[PDB]
């Protein structure tokens, strides 16, 4: 039809770029504890946390760069090129032949990580408005159908990534398991460039973030006859009202982003089931599959909550408010952190006496004789926390904000999620110093047995609990 081709191109680019991002995040921890990189578990977790935090901090900046200048389609194109350039560094590092030419060489992998983070951030910020204005003209129902397709594309890309790419990286090889995400980024860039002919490109109107920055840099508030209009001032006031909810959600984002950086690290030191029983170097169950499981869990209860729980509660009343749902989600993620700490304490008690070796990936881990499935609850808890906090958070942020601040509220949501990831990385670094010594050692290849992830998880749970009590107090006082 000449228009559904543009929507299909947007969906394909979205699927490929989510697939590559999740392929990187699923086994970056395993890769950084590898032959080229004999990093500590704390260092690998910090690197992955910083990477995710960058991917979510660049969303407001990517959106501003797309809206104030450079357009949106061209911004996504340059972001995809930058993202592919960053992706290229990973298979080269994995391959022994090319790692020598590239380079230990921590600067190379840090450059690749920051490049990939900027690309993912800009694409994440700009793709959703791009798809919307691709489909806005037909009508709100067409937009709803396209966004159903977009949601399914995102989830499908994440699922296929966390399954296939993680299995290939952990079991088959890291070179192929990192070239496949690079290949899919290449195809995403190619398909976006090809669909540039059929895309509906809008001129840069100007992001609301520059207006907010001008308001904060003053000429309540000033408003009226001064050099600023009333609606922008009211909108910035609404954003300021929204901000404390995200400030409260920051520790939730820390503990949530722990699911793929330190939870995978703890998985590497549990008895991972072996699912091949055939051929040399028998394949083990990918540590990222748990995350995939959790994602699958979301797919099985996002519609349920949208079709069974929410309508029944709406009919019967007693439906919790957005703030109450956020509090429930923070309680659930606190429970996940506490369960992770309990499991890690039991793991450290067990591994002190006996151990089992696990040559998962390409490095041998002194895992405890504890089943990996004992880590299933905490992961599931985080998933529940998601459907109770993240959505609700944004939902509340959408309730107390005007329609004009669409994609500016969402940008702030991503920014504060990235801030939570950065806070988690900084907390891990702080507890890794000699004064505290929870993660202070010289144990290469991760080898968390000498560290204390139980103390780190307990600290995260305590911070989440303090934040939850403060949130409950302020919600009761205000509402």
């Amino acid at each position: 039809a000449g228009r559904r081709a543009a929507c299909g191109a947007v969906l394909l680019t979205e699927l490929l770029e989510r697939a590559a991002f999740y392929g990187i995040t699923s086994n970056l921890v395993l890769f950084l504890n590898g032959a080229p990189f004999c990093w500590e578990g704390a260092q690998a977790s910090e690197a992955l946390l910083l990477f995710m935090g960058l991917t979510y901090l660049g969303s407001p900046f990517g959106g501003w760069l797309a809206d104030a200048r450079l357009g949106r389609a061209r911004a996504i194109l340059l972001s995809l090129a930058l993202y592919l350039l960053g992706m290229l560094a990973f298979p080269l590092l994995a391959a022994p032949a090319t790692r020598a030419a590239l380079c230990c060489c921590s600067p190379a992998t840090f450059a690749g990580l920051v490049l990939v983070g900027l690309g993912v951030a800009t694409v994440k910020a700009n793709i959703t408005p791009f798809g919307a204005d691709q489909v806005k003209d037909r009508g709100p129902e067409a937009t709803r159908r396209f966004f159903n397709w977009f949601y399914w594309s995102i989830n499908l890309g994440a699922i296929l990534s966390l399954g296939g790419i993680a299995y290939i990286q952990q079991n088959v090889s890291f070179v192929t398991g990192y070239a496949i995400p690079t290949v899919c980024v290449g195809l995403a860039f190619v398909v976006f460039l090809c669909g540039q002919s059929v895309f509906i490109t809008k001129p840069p109107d100007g992001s609301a973030f520059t207006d907010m920055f001008k308001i904060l840099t003053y000429s309540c508030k000033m408003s009226h006859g001064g050099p600023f209009t009333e609606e922008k001032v009211e909108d910035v006031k609404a954003l300021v009202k929204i901000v404390p909810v995200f400030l409260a959600l920051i520790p939730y984002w820390t503990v949530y982003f722990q699911m793929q950086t330190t939870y995978v690290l703890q998985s590497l030191h549990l008895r991972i089931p072996e699912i091949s029983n055939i051929t040399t170097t028998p394949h083990t169950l990918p540590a990222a599959w748990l995350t995939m499981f959790d994602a699958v869990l979301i797919l099985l209860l996002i519609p349920l909550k949208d079709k069974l729980v929410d309508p029944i509660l709406r009919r019967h009343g007693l439906l919790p408010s957005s703030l109450k749902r956020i509090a429930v989600g923070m309680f659930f993620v606190m429970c996940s952190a506490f369960a992770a700490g309990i499991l890690e304490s039991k793991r450290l008690n067990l591994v002190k006496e006996k151990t089992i070796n696990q040559t998962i990936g390409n490095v041998v881990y002194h895992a405890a004789d504890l089943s990996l499935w004992w880590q299933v609850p905490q992961y599931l808890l985080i998933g529940i926390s998601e459907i109770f906090a993240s959505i609700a958070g944004l939902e509340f942020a959408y309730s107390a904000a005007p329609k004009s601040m669409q994609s500016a509220i969402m940008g702030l949501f991503f920014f504060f999620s990235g801030v939570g990831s950065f806070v988690g990385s900084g907390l891990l670094a702080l507890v890794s110093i000699k004064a505290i010594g929870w993660m202070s050692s010289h144990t290469d290849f991760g080898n968390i047995n000498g560290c204390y992830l139980n103390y780190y998880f307990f600290l995260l749970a305590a911070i989440q609990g303090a934040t939850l009590l403060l949130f409950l107090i302020i919600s009761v006082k205000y509402d």
Partner: antibody, heavy 120, light 108 residues
Framework: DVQLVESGGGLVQPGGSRKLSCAAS????????MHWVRQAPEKGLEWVAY????????YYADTVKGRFTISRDNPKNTLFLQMTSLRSEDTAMYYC?????????????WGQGTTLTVSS | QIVLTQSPAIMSASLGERVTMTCTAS???????LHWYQQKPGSSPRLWIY???NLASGVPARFSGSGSGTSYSLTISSMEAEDAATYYC?????????FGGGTKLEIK
């Protein structure tokens, strides 16, 4: 280039203490978690102790659990095994073996071993 | 606690003869973590077969590892004079990593 020498073995009265040292060269001793394995005269090999790359994982055989103590000094690239309450059955040749934390895990390199005799 | 029993504890095989020694485990041992070490008398031990299939560096091709799970085996297609030594099966899977009982191989 890689090599492992042992020292400290000798005659020890029963109930005494002795500290067997293993000097490593030709590789990065910070990596490659080490093992102490003893072989009694005309008996087979017996794994005694293991220490990880960063002393995080430390394990001993049930026969040397409460007596032997394995440690590593990375900056001077050495492996220590200090043993107390020595009895007669501890008389053996001790080797410091190198374990790999790479695609395959095994005792790739062994030292010549040092003989410890616990008798009178 | 896995104990490895080697059968036979001692055997003599003539030159150019089929040689087979078995190593059974008290529990399940992953095939990738079973190794065979060769020890000459008066010399330190040496990896011979890692992951019960792959020959180590310098190992003659006549040697071959086999087996999986509980029972494994080291095999010589055609035994030669330099092959007379003591072979130990070692599981490096579950702590404690006890060695095998040993299998002394002699010329007949």
């Amino acid at each position: 280039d890689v090599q492992l020498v042992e020292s400290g073995g000798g005659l020890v009265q029963p109930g005494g203490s002795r500290k067997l040292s293993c000097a490593a060269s030709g590789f990065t001793f910070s990596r490659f978690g080490m093992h102490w394995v003893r072989q009694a005269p005309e008996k087979g090999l017996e794994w005694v102790a293991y220490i990880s790359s960063g002393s995080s994982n430390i394990y001993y055989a049930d026969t040397v659990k409460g007596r032997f103590t394995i440690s590593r000094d990375n900056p001077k690239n050495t492996l220590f095994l200090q043993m107390t309450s020595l009895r007669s059955e501890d008389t053996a040749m001790y080797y410091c073996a190198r374990s790999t934390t790479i695609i395959r895990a095994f005792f790739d390199y062994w030292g010549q071993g040092t003989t410890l005799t616990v008798s009178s | 606690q896995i104990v490895l029993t080697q059968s036979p504890a001692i055997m003599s095989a003539s030159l150019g003869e089929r040689v087979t020694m078995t190593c059974t485990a008290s529990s399940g041992v992953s095939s990738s973590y079973l190794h065979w070490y060769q020890q000459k008398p008066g010399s330190s031990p040496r990896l011979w077969i890692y992951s019960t299939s792959n020959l180590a560096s310098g190992v003659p091709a006549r040697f071959s590892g086999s087996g999986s799970g509980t029972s494994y085996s080291l095999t010589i297609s055609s035994m030669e004079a330099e092959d007379a030594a003591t072979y130990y099966c070692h599981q490096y899977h579950r702590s404690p990593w006890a060695f095998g009982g040993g299998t002394k191989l002699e010329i007949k």
